[PDB]
Amino acid sequence: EMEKEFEQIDKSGSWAAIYQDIRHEASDFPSRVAKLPKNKNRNRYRDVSPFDHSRIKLHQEDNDYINASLIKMEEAQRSYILTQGPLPNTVGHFWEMVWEQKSRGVVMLNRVMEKGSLKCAQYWPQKEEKEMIFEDTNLKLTLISEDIKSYYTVRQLELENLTTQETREILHFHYTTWPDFGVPESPASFLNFLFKVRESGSLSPEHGPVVVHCSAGIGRSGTFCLADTCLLLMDKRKDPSSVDIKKVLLEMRKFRMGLIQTADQLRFSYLAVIEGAKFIM
Numbered sequence: 001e002m003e004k005e006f007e008q009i010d011k012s013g014s015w016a017a018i019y020q021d022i023r024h025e026a027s028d029f030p031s032r033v034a035k036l037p038k039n040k041n042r043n044r045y046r047d048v049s050p051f052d053h054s055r056i057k058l059h060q061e062d063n064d065y066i067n068a069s070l071i072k073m074e075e076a077q078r079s080y081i082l083t084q085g086p087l088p089n090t091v092g093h094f095w096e097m098v099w100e101q102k103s104r105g106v107v108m109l110n111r112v113m114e115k116g117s118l119k120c121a122q123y124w125p126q127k128e129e130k131e132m133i134f135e136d137t138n139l140k141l142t143l144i145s146e147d148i149k150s151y152y153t154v155r156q157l158e159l160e161n162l163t164t165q166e167t168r169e170i171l172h173f174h175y176t177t178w179p180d181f182g183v184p185e186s187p188a189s190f191l192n193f194l195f196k197v198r199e200s201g202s203l204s205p206e207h208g209p210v211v212v213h214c215s216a217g218i219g220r221s222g223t224f225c226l227a228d229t230c231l232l233l234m235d236k237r238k239d240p241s242s243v244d245i246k247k248v249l250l251e252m253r254k255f256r257m258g259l260i261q262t263a264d265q266l267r268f269s270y271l272a273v274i275e276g277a278k279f280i281m
């Protein structure tokens, strides 16, 4: 059981030690397409790249590259697309991928500005009457509604294919209260957010994979998926205590490098799963 394993690592403060064994144990696959010189300007950080085998491809013939990985969890029957916060020059690309992958939801776990710097382009409209056009990808994006709460904001967006005149409703879940330094003290508000996305139908196999981003798409995005997947496996299994979070983290890291950036995030992920377990049972 992981609740006993928690106290153990916690009382002995072994979190930096555990996290280093996962660093050591993690997969390394090629990322040749990311390191191509033509794609230098499509990457937010040079040290965070999609693996070739799991990278999402854009259906434009010119350059199919975007910094985005498909995470397939076989046993949980869950998929996620993990991507960097879009750059000013890739907001078109980003909305093309959401179109092409038939995604219902976008989950955002960062503010546009943190620590006085830009962590992300403003890629959605701020006002109903001021829609955005992506000329390069031929998409129009309109704010339909917006429901601001203490910890998170939910927006209803209409994405239209200008080429074909099809329209789709997209939900944007934005967690607005991740602190600039560290992790939340309590996972209550993060668990509330997770369920809010789940109830929306955005995580369901009748839709394309959810799109999940922070700044690099590995730290906070990492915590989102890991909590979702572990909690779902505890429902799916005869013995819920057979679920090892280290095993699941390492299975996710086959798909995208670096998921969970700090020992703090690892601790917080155990805490979210452990608290989340009690809320169900």
Ligand SMILES: O=C1CCCc2nc3c(cc21)C(=O)CCC3
Pocket: 040, 041, 043, 044, 087, 088, 089
């Ligand atoms: O990382 C960024 C931020 C804004 C968009 C952007 N555009 C370019 C770069 C880098 C970035 C380059 O490295 C070369 C020129 C194009």
